[PDB]
């Protein structure tokens, strides 16, 4: 039940998508960049809060932010 | 005198502390022979101890009821009652040395940054340049006020802020 918002400064590196283990992020076409790509966060219900996505964004300041919030079974990474 | 402190010459506990510290060595000196090296070592320590006590008394120090010398910090009382060498004068002896270190390091930083690859110059120093600046810093207060009155000391809002 975490929140993931991507901002206007994305450049279509795809490094955020490759890093997330839980497949929260995917690439969508867009007209704002040279690469003509942008990220997205359709399924944040599966988000866990590892912040590997933030680690990979090479911008001056991040085009991706994970705002932590209410927890859940999927978010807490509980096998039980 | 001042602050209810006696001079160290007139104090009794000051001389009591001298007779004590010498008695320890005399007892320790009895064990060894006259012409041996342990005897010469202790006699020298005895000679130094006798010199430490008389020199502190000669210097117009102030000893308290415990018998130990006290220092005075206000330059007014220090100059009025002749206790300036204690604190007031060494204050200027340090600041001359401390500013020496700043004026030197500040110049090495500025000059290496005017060239290519200044990062290498920090881990691998230019020793000829460092010695040159280190022997040119005898008159750092002149250069500081020269650089302040000129305005090339401080930077002007070309620095990073956070908000």
């Amino acid at each position: 039940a975490h929140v993931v918002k991507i901002y206007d400064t994305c450049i279509g590196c795809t490094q955020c998508v490759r890093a997330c283990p839980l497949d929260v992020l995917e690439m969508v076409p867009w007209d704002g960049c040279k690469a003509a790509q942008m990220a997205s966060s359709p399924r944040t219900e599966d988000c866990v809060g590892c912040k590997r996505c933030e680690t990979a964004c090479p911008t001056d300041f991040l085009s991706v932010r994970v705002y932590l919030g209410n927890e859940s079974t999927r978010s807490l990474g509980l096998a039980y | 005198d001042i602050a209810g402190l006696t001079p160290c010459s007139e104090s009794k506990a000051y001389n009591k502390l001298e007779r004590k510290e010498l008695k320890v060595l005399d007892k320790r000196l009895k064990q060894y022979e006259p012409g041996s090296a342990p005897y010469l070592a202790l006699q020298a320590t005895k000679e130094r101890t006798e010199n430490r006590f008389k020199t502190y008394a000669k210097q117009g120090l102030l000893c308290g009821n415990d018998g130990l010398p006290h220092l005075i910090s206000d330059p007014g009382l220090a100059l009025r009652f002749n206790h300036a060498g204690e604190v007031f004068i060494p204050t200027f002896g340090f600041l001359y040395v401390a500013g020496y270190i700043g004026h030197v390091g500040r110049q090495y930083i500025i000059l290496s940054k005017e060239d290519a690859k200044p990062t290498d110059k920090e881990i691998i120093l230019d020793v000829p340049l460092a010695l040159k600046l280190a022997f040119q810093g005898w008159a750092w207060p002149l250069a500081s006020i020269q650089e302040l009155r000129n305005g090339s000391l401080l930077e002007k809002d070309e620095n990073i802020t956070v908000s």
């Binding site: - | 690859k117 990062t119 881990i123 691998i124």
Partner: protein, 106 residues
């Protein structure tokens, strides 16, 4: 089973003494932060991370172990020497119970 040796693999010179961080690919670039300094002294003796070759890791290890022996032997010789010139061994030998050892005069 037999002996096997490779002749003159490495040249001996102070060229790499001037270039710290040569062992690692990341550190050979140079410092832009002070973190490069801590990583230098840390990753220095992690030979497994420098290179994948098991042979080079073996050459480095077998030769570094010779260093610890030399470091030990001057330490051990120091105790014998400091015990010879700056000690009371001959006096303690004649009256061991009452006399105490000493080898570090100040």
């Amino acid at each position: 089973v037999k002996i096997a040796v490779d002749r003159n693999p490495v040249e001996t010179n102070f060229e790499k003494w001037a270039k710290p961080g040569h062992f690692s690919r990341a550190l050979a670039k140079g410092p832009n932060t002070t973190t490069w300094i801590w990583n230098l002294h840390a990753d220095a003796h992690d030979f497994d991370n420098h290179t994948s070759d098991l042979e080079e890791i073996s050459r480095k290890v077998f030769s570094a172990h010779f260093g610890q022996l030399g470091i030990i032997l001057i330490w051990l010789s120091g105790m014998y020497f400091h015990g010879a010139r700056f000690s009371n061994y001959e006096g303690w030998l004649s009256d061991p119970t009452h006399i105490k050892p000493s080898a570090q005069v100040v």
